[PDB]
Amino acid sequence: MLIQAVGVNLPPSYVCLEGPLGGERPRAQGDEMLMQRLLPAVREALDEAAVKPEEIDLIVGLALSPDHLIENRDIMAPKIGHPLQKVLGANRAHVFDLTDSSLARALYVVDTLASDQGYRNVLVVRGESSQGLEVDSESGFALADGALALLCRPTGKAAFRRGALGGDPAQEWLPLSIPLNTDIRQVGDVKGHLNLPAQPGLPEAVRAGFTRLAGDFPQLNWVREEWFGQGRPDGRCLGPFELASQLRAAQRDRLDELLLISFDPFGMVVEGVTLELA
Amino acid sequence: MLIQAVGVNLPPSYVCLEGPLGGERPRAQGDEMLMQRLLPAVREALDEAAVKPEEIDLIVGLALSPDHLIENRDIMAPKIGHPLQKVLGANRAHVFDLTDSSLARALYVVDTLASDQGYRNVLVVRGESSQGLEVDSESGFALADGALALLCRPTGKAAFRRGALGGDPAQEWLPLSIPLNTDIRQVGDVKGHLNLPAQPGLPEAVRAGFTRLAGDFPQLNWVREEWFGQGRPDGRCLGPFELASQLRAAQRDRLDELLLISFDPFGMVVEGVTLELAG
Amino acid sequence: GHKVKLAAITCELPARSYENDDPVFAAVPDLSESWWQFWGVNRRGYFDPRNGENEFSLVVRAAERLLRSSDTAPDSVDMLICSASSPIMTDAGDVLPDLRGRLYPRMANVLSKQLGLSRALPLDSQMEAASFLLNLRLAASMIRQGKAEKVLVVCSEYISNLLDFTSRTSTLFADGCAVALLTRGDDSCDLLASAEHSDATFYEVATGRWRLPKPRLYFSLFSDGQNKMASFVPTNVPIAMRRALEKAGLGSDDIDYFVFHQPAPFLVKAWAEGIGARPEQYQLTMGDTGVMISVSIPYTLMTGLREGKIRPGDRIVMAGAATGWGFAAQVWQLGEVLVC
Amino acid sequence: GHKVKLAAITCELPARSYENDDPVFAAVPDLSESWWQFWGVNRRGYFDPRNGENEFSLVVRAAERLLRSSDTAPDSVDMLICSASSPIMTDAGDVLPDLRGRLYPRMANVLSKQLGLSRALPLDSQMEAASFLLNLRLAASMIRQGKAEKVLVVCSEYISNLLDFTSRTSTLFADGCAVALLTRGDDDSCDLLASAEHSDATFYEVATGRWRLPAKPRLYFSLFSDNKMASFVPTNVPIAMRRALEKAGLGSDDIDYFVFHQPAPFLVKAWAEGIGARPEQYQLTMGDTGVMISVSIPYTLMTGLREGKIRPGDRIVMAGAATGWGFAAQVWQLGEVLVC
Ligand SMILES: [Cl-]
Ligand code: NA
């Protein structure tokens, strides 16, 4: 998998949440919806790579947000890849969604499918506009809002690793879940609740997982997602969106290859994919 | 036909057009549409009579305006009676439209149909939001804009008369036509043109027609439409909407019966209908 | 009051017929045998104005033929009731000889003068596809109350000039005219009862809108499933029939034959089943005409008379739906009807 | 280029079957034989969560059966690919015993722990009704490129807990589950020869799920006249089939049998006729199951295998459409498939 370009568009408004899994993260406001940020991020990437919408072979979406996706804020399905195809004029694309996949896992799977199908231009998008989910007030866990666009050229050569978290190997980490709101009375009530129990050693265990996994490709520089504020400048973190500034640093540094490392709070694992750079 | 109640709502802007068929008439502005004006007129009448929307048996519309009827200003069909039924919740009603009919004629026909079907509450509505029609700049002829709601209780007893115009018997009167605009290029362009040839004796001929017709019911006070400004204070005229203040004067004066007279510019005739008033 | 007689009826269709495979449909998406069977359409006519056919000229022809054939003097017609669903009229004959494409006046004001109907009160009514029934109903009330003795009823549908021939919907609709004569009866024929109602829930589903390259059909359904009519489809037409039958003190078994509006075979069948009508008690006529808006009902009535399916002394129910939405039903006892 | 073997397949349907006249439909507007004929539905199942039946429990049952029957050690499974069209999941077994109604996680993470699939990469994908094809496609690319030797594929549709039994739409859809096993093939006897997938978002907004107050996701319809697809209905499925066939260097005539998504009989026929498939070369299965979203295809495949319509050594085309909209076709050379 070769990364041709990256686009990012994040809300300017940040919200801080206390707790061992807390931090200061971008947050979509009021009525704002994902497409408002996703479309410019995608355009940014298309413009950088000099690829037209009609040249896109595949669009693959990753978005947990259960509403606030498009102009009709109550739509949850079909998923955002479809209206994205429409507003782009991506008239040659196949569109599907990978749900709760990590980005690293999605890139690997997509590299594999897309190289096997002979595709040349593949769009992977990750986004959130999470007003429809209640934050975890006990742990401080929340999703970063915003949009990331990766315009890729498949090679079928991306290598992949799925690794355990570090720290105490007997510790049963409690995963993220998103229960449905069973008391939806009014318009604008949340549709679900973020539930990630307070586990103060978790950020460090994730970092230790990253460091172990990076050892499978010890000559590659690596980039990673930052889902927690602990230990970070300003306590600020961008979740998977943190990847953008790091990929851009890599392009600036003229790297040909790198390791991209995701954290999956559903599986409580870390996942890495090896990528080429334009 | 018994008139239970009347609602009227006219634009605040009166616009003067010069010409033998000119006058100063109410005019809808910008993107105003007929429903905005009609709905409150209708509600005034329903509130006065204490008649609920679900009690309405029949809704009959009269509106020439080829657009500016409802929220979507480009819709012309189906006609305004149908979205009216929707917004009111008039869920027991039958809805139809009588097109280019005069009001007197519509009231007669409706009295007849509705008494024969046993209806009790009938809503006859007349309105214009005529931005979609070009005024007749040569004659000065324009439609008055506004809304009139007549809540009726049919009796089947309404008498009707259709009469010729007055003035010179040898004079051939040239009717109103509304040709289609054959050069609709932009949005906001008119859909048709008001074409009523300049005929300076026409206002007086209509008025003499009114008087002749009224002579068939010498026992009745009468009310009439005024479509032309010639000879009227400040050239002000309200077209069919002139009827509202006259009907209210009639109730205040405790009239039980009256004659209502319309001018039909399409047929160039005058038409009268006899009505009872509530009280 | 007086008994109402359905005295005579005629129709005038376009001279030219267009098959399902006709090149007029070249820009329409390919349609299969499945579509044609489902809608029940095989061919249809469109007015050719270049050759003098239009909403007015054909009505003049049909009306002149009917008046001659029914031995009706023009001066004896007390009311003329016309309907035309298109907002655009195109011809005013000798009456307004220079006027071509127009919004107003409507037909009756002009047709009355063209035909020399010098005592006829002119009226132009609109209830879309149910307009023939509305007009029979208006006519019947006038006759019954003694306010008219002879009423001429017209429906004329020039819809082909508004159709979008890039669209599948353009394959369903077609042009045509109908004229009927109603008179004071005695006493072989009568309108026993009628019922009319309207429901505007789905008003916005089918509208005419001014569209730059003039009126065009627009569709607009936005629904949850939760906002239905008080009476669900397809029971509105049956409900109208029942209300009419009840007012007449009759049941379905008292009826010989049924005449329906003709939008699709499944819908007509649904209406028939809703009231107890057996398949052989009505005809499907959309096959060689297409859907002619207000003119489908009278054309179907006439067909049934002409083919011997409906005859003197028969009790019939006529019924249909219209955009808006509107519903109408009539119970007639028919005497002898002149088909001309 | 390793060969891809479709090794095994099974389904798990609800224990209870519901007829068209079943009282579960009492609040649905009355429907006729016209509705039932058109959609081709006679009966369908709904999961009963009170008797332990749901999207998760029935998959666990089916998957355990398939693994036991195909002699597949849980350790040997390299990847697990799940789909479920409903946004709501309801049960996480022994893994998350307290969690009930949920948006996330999806199935694969949880299922792989429940089944002991200790090496399986979990993936949850979404392409609505076409998800079984997507999943085979993903599985095949992984096998083909040497990245997996065994892949378990799951589609599970629990739609009945979302259906509005006051709506006609409730009569069309039903519940079910399917599980398949793909492996690296030894010999030439089984392979995925080619596939084609495409999407068209022109009519994206026509059928959407929305959060609606009475409060849960509901189907919402939106059609406005205020563009057509590049390829008109009903050609998108045939276009996908043609592309796949071209990529495999085959023609329609080289194909033994066809397996289609099952939304309605006229549509399936239209797809078949578009590619040149004869009526004896495919089955209609919606009659017994209802429309099971993603599960209709694998149920149909399984049916054809079980009944001897699809035999070892046959070349088949599998194809369908999905909301969004999406289109997928696959050309398989099949060997021996364990139906369990
Ligand atoms: Cl997992
Ligand atoms: Na005179």
Residue numbers in the entry:
A (entry chain B): 1 to 278
B (entry chain E): 1 to 279
C (entry chain F): 1 to 185, 187 to 214, 222 to 348
D (entry chain C): 1 to 214, 221 to 232, 235 to 348
Paper passage:
PqsBC, a key enzyme in the biosynthesis of the quorum-sensing signal molecules HHQ and PQS and a member of the β-ketoacyl-ACP-synthase III family of condensing enzymes, has unique features of a heterodimeric subunit composition and the lack of the canonical active-site asparagine. FabH-like enzymes are usually homodimers in solution; however, the PqsBC crystal structure we report here reveals that PqsB and PqsC form a novel heterodimer. PqsC lacks the conserved asparagine, and PqsB lacks all three conserved residues of the FabH catalytic triad, raising the question of how PqsBC mediates the condensation reaction.
PqsBCC129A crystallized in space group P212121 and the structure was determined to 2 Å resolution with the final model refined to crystallographic R-factors of Rwork = 0.190 and Rfree = 0.237. An analysis of the interfaces reveals a large ∼2,238 Å2 surface area buried by interactions formed between the PqsB and PqsC subunits as shown in Fig. 2A. The structure is thus referred to as the PqsBCC129A heterodimer. This large interface between PqsB and PqsC is observed to be almost identical in the four copies observed in the asymmetric unit (values of buried surface area are 2,277, 2,240, 2,223, and 2,212 Å2 averaged to 2,238 Å2), and the heterodimers superimpose onto each other well with an average root mean square deviation of 0.243 Å (8,182 atoms). The fold of PqsC and PqsB is closely related to the FabH enzymes and PqsD with two subdomains each composed of a four-stranded β-sheet surrounded by α-helices. Substantial differences occur in the C-terminal subdomains with PqsB having a shorter sequence (124 amino acids) with only two α-helices and PqsC (160 amino acids) having four α-helices. The active-site residues His-269 and the mutated Ala-129 (replacing Cys-129) are clearly defined in the electron density. In a noticeable difference with other members of the FabH enzyme family, an asparagine amino acid does not form a catalytic triad with His-269 and Cys-129, and in its place a valine (Val-299) is present. Pro-242 breaks the helix α5 in PqsC and directs an alternate path for the polypeptide compared with FabH/PqsD forming an irregular loop structure, termed loop A, which effectively opens up the active site cleft. The shortened PqsC helix α5, a prominent difference to PqsD and FabH, widens the entry to the catalytic site and provides an extended cavity that could accommodate a bicyclic molecule such as the reaction product HHQ.
